[PDB]
Point group: C3
Chain length 67, copies 3
């Protein structure tokens, strides 16, 4: 060998470990992006459900006055 | 055996991939702040609607009475 | 020109940066969980209110 060759090969191994660790981070952030896409849809749906209920309550308020 | 330049290239490509992740994380934080605000808006519109429904229940009690 | 020394240092710097990113991800994973719990609570309150509205509608129709 040679001390320089050793250091080079150990550097490659350290880099490979870092890649594996970053790869796990990549999967974690991907779950985060899916969760976020879902939040966006859930909020939209909740917003529509409340507008539906608001409309129904307006109708009842109007019906209440009439009666 | 890996060479200096091959290691250098592999490191630069790892740095690029991670830099892409770092940029994505900016879009995530953006979204999170916006979603928090949207949730507070929804919470308030529901609290408002609760109060109207409570008032309707009270009006109905008065009319029944 | 590129030395083994410069590459070792460049990897250490990249490790530091990537570790800081991992912390941020950790903080957001926790955050997103607390958020989803708040969102489900809001969904539950709206479902409860829907039930109360139905009962009002039905009482109103009795008179």
């Amino acid at each position: 060998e040679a001390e320089a060759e050793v250091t080079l090969r150990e550097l490659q191994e350290a880099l490979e470990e870092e890649v594996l660790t970053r790869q796990s981070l990549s999967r974690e952030m991907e779950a985060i992006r899916t969760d976020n896409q879902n939040f966006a849809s859930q909020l939209r749906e909740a917003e529509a459900r409340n507008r539906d209920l608001e409309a129904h309550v307006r109708q009842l308020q109007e019906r209440m006055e009439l009666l």
